[PDB]
Amino acid sequence: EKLKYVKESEKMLNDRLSLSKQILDLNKSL
Amino acid sequence: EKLKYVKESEKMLNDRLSLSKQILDLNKSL
Amino acid sequence: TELFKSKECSLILEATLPNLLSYNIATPDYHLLQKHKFPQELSDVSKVACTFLCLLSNDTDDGAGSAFCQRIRPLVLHKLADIPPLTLALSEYMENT
Amino acid sequence: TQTNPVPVTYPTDAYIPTYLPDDKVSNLADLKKLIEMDSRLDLYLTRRRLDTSILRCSITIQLRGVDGGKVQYSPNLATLIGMQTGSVNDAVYSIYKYILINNLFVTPELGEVKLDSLLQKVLDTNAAHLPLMNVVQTVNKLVSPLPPIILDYAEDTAKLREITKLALQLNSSAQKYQFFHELSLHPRETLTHYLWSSKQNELVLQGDQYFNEDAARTSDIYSNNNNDRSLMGNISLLYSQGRL
Amino acid sequence: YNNVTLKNLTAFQLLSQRENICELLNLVESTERHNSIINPERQRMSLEEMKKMLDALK
Incomplete structure (x- = not known):
């Protein structure tokens, strides 16, 4: 269970960092 | 803790579903 | 494979x-x-543990070492976030995940 | 805790004799089984206790719930993570994991990092190589505290002591058994051993008798005591060395 | 009394050595140092406590 929680939380934090990188693609067009 | 870890993993899956709905909002924001 | 064999000797190092x-x-x-x-230093056992862990990280072909080292890196990454000598240390284990 | 173990005066975990005959007792191996039972159970409890954590005036009011659980981020550091106000350690962990994803260390070689556009905007720097110590040190500066509401306009030690004392009583009984057992095996060379060793012990205990308070102030040490032979023979040696 | 000395170790060895040769001739009783350590009512109380632990663990 501790493996299955961490392997999802790290992917969620990676998705949040990818969205934070994609916010720059909307800020550079304005 | 065995119950609490599964209870938090389901909340992380619901947060992943909310992030997928945010992606679906970004698909119609353009 | 001899060291990571039994059910009570391979879980102490976890x-x-x-x-x-x-x-x-x-x-x-x-x-x-x-x-x-911020400490900016290490201890006497820390360099020995880092050298032992980096030489343990050389287990290729996904044997008894590489199966062990994948369950320890999300806990070692919590300690590398606080100690900046642990960025200079553990060089090969970060390259070999 | 300390680096070295704490020196104590009381004994702890004394030995168990193995020279006792097992045909009559048949319990020392069972006591060893109890000792290894206690060691395995204490091993599991120690591993569990280690794994369990690893004029218009303004109105200002100092609130009661001002805590360090949610501490405010700067707007430069907030857009690099994504969260508004999460924690104080999750920000450092997210910045370190973001650098680890970007692979800015190497493709010192690990201290100095490659400054990206966001890493220069959040730090107000212009250098190419900068150490991770100075990266992490500015994080305490870039995080601001939460603003208030502003409205303008035991028994185990004594038990182990009792077990150790009872084991010392067992050691005394075992040594007193072993002495009579060796005296039963051989009667000859242990009584001459007694008549030698007890005589030498009486000579050692009778070796400090001429150095008392009222015995040294009198004159029945120096005068006419040539049978003593301990002193009054080194006066030709101590005078040649200057000790007087 | 926390530390031992040369005279203390020699006197300890001598008192532990005289009492062994004192029991062969049987000129000392040495029964108060026997009964107070054996204590047969404490021994049968110990057996009753082990039987009570058997009854509690079954």
Whole structure:
């Protein structure tokens, strides 16, 4: 269970960092 | 803790579903 | 495969081996940051534990070492976030995940 | 805790004799089974206790719930993570994991990092190589505290002591058994051993008798005591060395 | 009394050595140092406590 929680939380934090990188693609067009 | 870890993993899956709905909002924001 | 064989000898290093890394090191605490209302060094056992872990990381072909080292890196990464000598240390284990 | 173990005066975990005959007792191996039972159970409890954590005036009011659980981020550091106000350690962990994803260390070689556009905007720097110590040190500066509401306009030690004392009583009984057992095996060379060793012990205990308070102030040490032979023979040696 | 000395170790060895040769001739009783350590009512109380632990663990 501790493996299955961490392997999802790290992917969620990676998705949040990818969205934070994609916010720059909307800020550079304005 | 065995119950609490599964209870938090389901909340992380619901947060992943909310992030997928945010992606679906970004698909119609353009 | 001899060391990571039994059910009581291969589970001590699941928790003690990250614990010996941040040993006798003034880690930045958070209780004083939660109750308002950096070390720059290492220890004697820390370099030995880092060298042992980096030589343990050389287990290729996904044997008894590479299956062990994948369950320890999300806990060692919590300790590398606080101690900046642990960025200079553990060089090969980060390259071999 | 300390680096070295604490020196104590009381004994702890004394030995168990193995020279006792097992045909009559048949319990020392069972006591060893109890000792290894206690060691395995204490091993599991120690591993569990280690794994369990690893004029218009303004109105200002100092609130009661001012805590360090949610501490405010700068707007430069907030857009690099994504969260508004999460924690104080999750920000440092997210910045370190973001650098580890970007692979800015190497493709010192690990201290100095490659400054990206966001890493220069959040730090107000212009250098190409900068150490991770100075990266992490500015994080305490870039995080601001939460603003208030502003409205303008035991028994185990004594038990182990009792077990150790009873084991010392067992050691005394075992040594007193072994002495009579060796005296039963051989009666000859242990009584001459007694008549030698007890005589030497009486000579050692009778070796400090001429150095008392009222015995040294009198004159029945130096005068006419040539049978003593301990002193009054080194006066030709101590005078040649200057000790007087 | 926390530390031992040369005279203390020699006197300890001598008192532990005289009492062994004192029991062969049987000129000393040495029964108060026997009964107070054996204590047969404490031994049968120990057996009753082990039987009570058997009854509690079954």
